[PDB]
Amino acid sequence: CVIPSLYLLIITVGLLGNIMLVKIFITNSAMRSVPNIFISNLAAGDLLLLLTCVPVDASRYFFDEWCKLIPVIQLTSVGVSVWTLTALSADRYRAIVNPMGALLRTCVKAMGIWVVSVLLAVPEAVFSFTACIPYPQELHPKIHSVLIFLVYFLIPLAIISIYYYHIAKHLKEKAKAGAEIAAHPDAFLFLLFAAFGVVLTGDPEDRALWAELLALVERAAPGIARALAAAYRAAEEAYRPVAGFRAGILGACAGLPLTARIVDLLRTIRALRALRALVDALGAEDALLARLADLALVALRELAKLSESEMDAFIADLTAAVEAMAKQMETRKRLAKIVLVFVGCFIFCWFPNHILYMYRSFNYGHMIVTLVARVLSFGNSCVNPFALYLLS
């Protein structure tokens, strides 16, 4: 009575959720990216699992008589789901860290995971009255169940956790910076102008001491040094001056106060060409230091070769790009936490199923635990789209 009602309710909820998910993907394929395609693959896998797990239970409940392909399809479904979760976590890591023909590559990766799943579900058809009983009559069931646990639960979630460790680390470093580049500034936002004279004067007589200055800053300020290194790398790449300056400032302002103080310093330098006094004041916070101040003054002079109207457009573009990059990072972390919710619900719902299936290899509230575990397995697919609906 209670069990059939709750089972039908959750089955309907999950089927409707996955159908709505895939239908939304079909309708709005015009807005579909790596994450959208991967959650589409997840929805397809979950829906196939539902459609192949309903009939066996229905036949075993409302009948007593009923084998080589259904378990293959079910294992294919679970493999597709979990490996697409892994690929989605990898996408989140590669999109959050590195950007602090692609879509076709994601599509062929989806094809690849489908194919490797249907190839890894081949052994199922080997060993699967009128009751389709795969379990024959010691080591084969346990070994197969452990293999399914490893291939389908353990290493995929392990990869997801590994690639979220370096999504937490990146944000922790970005938080350490800003706080460090705002407490005792003018070591930053001045060396950031001694990292542009190096770009301007390409002679090795500048970079030879610029590398040493970066090493000293790292010995004295880690976040400042990493921001300066990213700034100079971007500036050198985009130089081949204004583009180099924009790239350097953008890379530096990536781990709120820094943009404001830098805009103020640029405005002050716009009318200094007594610039030496301002450079000395900025660098107040050792002949190598004098040479670095000279290079910073060179970069300030280069910036001075810009009209009042021209510099305003430059600072406006720079601050707009800073804001856009911050917003994109926030959106990326929001999608990362949504996928983390997906992984959490998946583990909470599929750990009981996996542990019970590993235990059942021994036996090749028992009924109530079995039915609640199956309802939980379906509830995973129930709450994936519910999580995406509520969180987004």
| Interacting residue ranges for ligand A1D63, rule: CB under 6 A | 49, 53, 56, 67, 70-71, 74-75, 78, 124, 127-128, 132, 134-135, 140-141, 144, 148, 152, 353-354, 357, 364, 377
Minimum distance, C-beta of residue 245 to ligand A1D63, in the bound complex (Å): 55
Q: Supply the minimum distance, in Å, between the C-beta of residue 49 and ligand A1D63.
A: 6
Min dist CB 124 to ligand A1D63, Å, is 5
Contacts of 287 (CB under 8 A, 6+ apart): none
Which of 114/152 has CB closer to ligand A1D63? 152
Task: Say how far apart CA 193 and CA 168 lie, in whole Å.
Answer: 30
Whichever of 40 and 76 has its CB closer to ligand A1D63, that residue is 76
The nearer residue to ligand A1D63, 30 or 139, going by C-beta atoms, is 139
Smallest gap from residue 334 Cβ to ligand A1D63 (A): 30
Whether the CB-CB separation of 153 and 82 falls below 8 Å is answered with yes
3-state SS assignment for residue 194: coil
The residue sitting closest to ligand A1D63, measured at its beta carbon, is 141
Of the pair 132, 326, the CB lying nearest ligand A1D63 is at 132
Q: How far apart are CA 353 and CA 381, in angstroms?
A: 13
| Residue 236, both tokens | 């050198």
In the bound state with ligand A1D63, the residue whose beta carbon lies nearer, of 57 and 312, is 57
What DSSP state is assigned to residue 55?
A: H
- Helix locations, the chain, DSSP H: 2-27, 34-61, 70-96, 103-120, 139-149, 155-179, 197-200, 204-220, 222-239, 242-252, 257-269, 275-282, 287-304, 308-360, 366-391
Smallest separation, CB 376 to ligand A1D63 (Å) = 10
Closer by beta carbon to ligand A1D63, 226 or else 354 = 354
Name the minimum Å distance from CB 156 to ligand A1D63.
Answer: 12
Q: Please tell me the distance from the alpha carbon of residue 312 to that of residue 303, in angstroms, as a whole number.
A: 12
Burial of 194 (0-12, 13-18, 19+ CB in 10 A): buried
